[PDB]
Every structure is written in C-alpha cells, then in structure tokens.
C-alpha cells in the first residue's frame, strides 16, 4: 500500500502519524531525524604552502669570465656581475683588482612544513543529501542511514520506505572553496598557472608530493655589497601570510540558515531548509482487525492547563469508557495542535492525560482516539519567559 | 596579443590560422588535435559473478 507524507527538514523534533484503513485499526508511525548531512561533489585541484628561497653558494671566478647554466628549477633567476673584490676571514680571497666575476642563481622550493601546514583548493557543486533516521512503524523501531535521493529504498519487515529528493537545491558553499586547518572559507583564488606575486597562489603545486611546482614570486637578484661574498635577493612577502593576516570570518559563523560545518570529509548538516517527502510501501500483513483492538464509547475532552509556548504546554484530560484495555494511537488530523506522545496505554474505565503544543488563543481541535473522534475546545493563557533555549515544536497558522 | 579562433572538433586534420597585426608581418599557426578524450566522471556501486 502506497502512502505519501512530507517532513520539514529539521532534526530533534519527532513526528507522529497514523495510517487509517477504512475497515481496520489505524497503524501508527513515528519518525525522528538525527542528523541531516549535505555533502558536495568536491574535486581537489591544487595545494600551496610556505616557500623557501633556495640559494646555492656563489660561483666566484678570479680574473676570468663565467656562464649561466639553467638548472630549470621553478622561477629560477641567474645573473653574473664583474668588478667584485671579495674578502675572507684569512685576508683577501683574490689578489686581482678588477675582472673578477661572480655568478648567482636563485630559486624557490617547498618548505619542510608543507605536510602539516598547507591550504587546499576545492571546486564544489552538486550537493547530495544523506540522513540518519530513527523510525518505528507498527512497534518496529529501527535506526538506519538512508539515501534520501529519489531511489535506494531501505526495507525492514517488508515495509519499504523511500525518501524523495529535496524541494530546494540550495547549498551553503560557493563554487570555489579554500580549506585550511579544519576551517572553511568561500574565496576566489586564482586558478592554476595564473598566480601573481604578493597574493594567494604565488606558488602552485598539483599535489602535496607532486614534485613539480609553478611559481611567480618575482625574485630579483641584486649587486652584493663590496668586500663581502653574499647574494642579496628581493621578492614580495608571502601572499599566504598576507591572506593569513586578512582572514575574513569563517563560513562556520557566516553561513545562512545556521549551517554547521565539519571536515573529516567536507560536509554540512543540522540546519533546516525545505521539506523531505516520504513514500511508504506497506505489505498487507501488518494490518490488524478492529475487534482485536480496544474500542471506546462516550469519550469526552477537558482542557486542564494551557500555555501556548514553544514547548508542549497544553494538558488535556480525556475521560473514556473502553470495551478492552490496550494501547492505541492518538492523532490530531490538522496542524492546530501537535501531541507529545505516539501512543497511550488505556485502561477499562480510567482517564488519560495528554500533552500537546498549540499557538491558538482559543483552540478547538478534533482529536482521533483509538477508533473514534472527540472535539476538545477551550481558551489558553500566554507564557511567562520571554526567551527559551529550544526551537518551535508546532506550526504557525494564519 | 589577444586572438580568438574556432576549430571544428575532429582528429587527423591539420588546421591553419594567421594572426594579422597592423604593424607586423602576419604570424601563421598550425594546430593538429592528435587525440580528444571524453572522460566521464564515474562511480562504483557493486560487483557480481557466478
């Protein structure tokens, strides 16, 4: 048997319903989502980190000339100058006065700290949604992970539940993301091969251990000071460090809908947007005959206490007269009031107490008891606390 | 210098273009697409056998 239902996407708050066959006792269903995660299609593109100015020993030739040999290291710069008069601790390295030549060749290499400190680039799109559900259909309670796309049902006791796709394809992430130290930021980094000096992406590497890197640090060699063997070099500061000092606030606190971010793998969860539809396929063996369940007669409502707060604040005493003692489900067909419990145990000639939540000053709602209906009515009082520490359990009717 | 052109997708045929600047002699360019690959982005689900 095919049944359709809808669920506002939000964890914690439970959901109660009864499927009512025209000639058999209603079958109860309870649903509780635990975690609703949303994982994107994310493909890694590159990685960056601190760089280190690789500088060999200066190549000095004394009264002669030299040439440049390109090692083809990334962003290599080579230069030769004349008219050098170097010194050493033990006097003069040379005796020549002029014609001396010195050659400098400089480059960049990845810092030793690349493994533990490195910012990753990511291209995100195509969010897929997963969920953990705690569902009980006909006192068959289960906790299970389910693919809530438009296929992939999960079956237990013959009951086949299918959670359809979301009504909204919104995602908190932008197309290009940057990851670092477990924090996530939506940033527009320049793409591979187009890095610029003094900004993010000056040094470029396909992977952590690619061993082939592109670089634009704009390294410039300079004439060393006279009477000293050394090589002065000038370059823009680390754009990674400039971005480190800039660091706009994190997505964990900037995202709308209050979406929390964890990255063991990149994912976002526990934030309410849209609705998830549920499709039940129930086998015909789970339906029980009416005579095998208690049936009531002359049942009446009374409203004992009212507080139309966020939490359940309506207490109702229902007085009944039963042919049998046995548990049955109680349901409110409309959204006027939402009950707290999925089932209530029932004596022969006792009275039942029911907790519910409503936002109506003058509620008048029809409850469905084991096989009959009763019409509870009354007025209700405002709350006392201005703010609470939990969300709303009910809807806001117009 | 910015230049734009189009190449009909097919392999085995050389394609010719010329970059024509006003103040310099035209520069010819010849491009041959040796192999064009269509890589789907794919996932695994399960395996089966006897």
């Amino acid at each position: 048997y095919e049944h359709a239902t809808t669920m506002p996407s939000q964890a914690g708050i439970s959901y109660n319903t009864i499927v009512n066959r025209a000639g058999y006792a209603p079958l109860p269903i309870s649903i509780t989502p635990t975690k609703i995660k949303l994982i994107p299609t994310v493909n890694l593109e590159y990685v960056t980190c601190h760089y280190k100015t690789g500088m060999d020993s200066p190549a000095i030739k004394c009264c002669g000339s030299q040439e440049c040999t390109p090692t083809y290291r990334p962003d290599e710069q080579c230069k030769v100058f004349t008219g050098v008069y170097p010194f050493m601790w033990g006097g003069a390295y040379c005796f020549c006065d002029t014609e001396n030549t010195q050659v400098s060749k400089a480059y960049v290499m990845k810092s030793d700290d690349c493994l533990a400190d490195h910012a990753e680039a990511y291209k995100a799109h195509t969010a897929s949604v997963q969920a953990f559900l705690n569902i009980t259909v006909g006192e068959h309670s289960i906790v299970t992970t389910v693919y809530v796309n438009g296929e992939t049902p999960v079956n237990f006791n013959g009951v086949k539940i299918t959670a359809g796709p979301l009504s909204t394809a919104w995602t908190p992430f932008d197309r290009k993301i940057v990851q670092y130290a477990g924090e996530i930021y939506n940033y527009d980094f320049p793409e591979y091969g187009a890095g610029q000096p003094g900004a993010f992406g000056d040094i470029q590497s396909r992977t952590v251990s690619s061993s082939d890197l592109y670089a634009n640090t704009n390294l410039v060699l300079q004439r060393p000071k006279a009477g000293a063997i050394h090589v002065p070099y000038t370059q823009a500061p680390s754009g990674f460090e400039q971005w480190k000092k800039d660091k706009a606030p994190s997505l964990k606190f900037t995202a709308p809908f209050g979406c929390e971010i964890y990255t063991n793998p990149i994912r976002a969860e526990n934030c309410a947007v849209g609705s998830i539809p549920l499709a039940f396929d129930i086998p015909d063996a789970l339906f029980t005959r009416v005579s095998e369940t208690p049936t009531l007669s002359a049942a009446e409502c009374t409203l004992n206490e009212c507080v139309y707060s966020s939490d359940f604040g309506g207490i109702a005493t229902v007085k009944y007269s039963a042919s049998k003692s046995g548990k049955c489900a109680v349901h409110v067909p409309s959204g006027t009031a939402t009950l707290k419990e999925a089932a209530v145990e029932l004596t022969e000639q006792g009275s039942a107490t029911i907790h519910f939540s409503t936002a109506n000053i003058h509620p008048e709602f029809r409850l469905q008891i084991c096989t009959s209906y009763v019409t509870c009515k009354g007025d209700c009082h405002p709350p006392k606390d201005h703010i609470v520490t939990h969300p709303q359990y009910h809807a806001q009717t117009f | 210098y910015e230049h734009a052109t189009t190449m009909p997708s097919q392999a085995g045929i050389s394609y010719n273009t010329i970059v024509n600047r006003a103040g310099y002699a035209p520069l010819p360019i010849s491009i041959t697409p040796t192999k064009i690959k269509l890589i789907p982005t794919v996932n695994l689900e399960y395996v089966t056998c006897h």
Partner: nanobody, 122 residues
C-alpha cells in the same frame, strides 16, 4: 585526486631477487583491483601480475618465479621478483581499477603511475 607511487628497480645481475612496491595516495578507502604491467622497448603493453583480495592470477611467462602480495589496509602491492632472465628487462607500471571513493566525490575510474625501470645484466 588519487595517484600511484612506484618504488624499486635498478641494475642487477641475472639470477637475483628484487621487490617492487606501488603505493596509493589520495581520497580512497577501498580498492577493488591492483595489477602490474610491463612494457619492453619496441613492443606493446602486457600484464604480469594480477592481485585483488585473496585471489591471484599469473601470466604464462611469469609462473613460478614472481609473487604478488596486496595490503588493502595500506593500499599497497609488493611484487617479490625472483629468478631473473635477460628477457625480463622493462619498465613496470602499477594499475588500480574499480576505485571506491569514500564519498569521496566520484571521479576518474583508473589511474596510472610513472613506473620504475628494471634492467638485468647477463
């Protein structure tokens, strides 16, 4: 992205015994297949070893001499290579197929490492 890193090889005399290792890095949790292929100069690509879980398979010209072991926990394969003949010189590549990304953005199926050179001297 997922990659394969190959280590081992070198120049040795005939009759020696070496080990070739290939390791997988990236966003992977389980691997369905890992195999070895050899490419000699002037010829085409051929298979040598074939390991996946407990089962193993060997070619006609490699039986009884080379042994393949796989470690899915480390996602590595070790080809213990013995009884060298002059025809065994080639560049060896390690291949991985049926990759199950850990959701794990689905991506390319197969991968190919750079490989290692094995040369044998009479």
């Amino acid at each position: 992205e997922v990659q394969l890193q190959a280590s081992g090889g070198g120049l040795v005399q005939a009759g020696g015994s070496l080990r070739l290792s290939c390791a997988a890095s990236g966003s992977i949790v389980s691997i369905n297949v890992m195999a070895w292929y050899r490419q000699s100069p002037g010829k085409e690509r051929e298979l040598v070893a074939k390991s996946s879980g407990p089962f193993t398979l060997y070619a006609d010209s490699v039986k009884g001499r080379f042994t393949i072991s796989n470690d899915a926990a480390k996602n590595t394969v070790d080809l213990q290579m013995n009884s060298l003949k002059p025809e065994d010189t080639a560049v060896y590549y390690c291949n991985a197929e049926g990759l199950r990304y850990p959701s794990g953005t689905y991506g390319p199926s197969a991968v190919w490492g750079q490989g290692t050179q094995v040369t044998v001297s009479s």
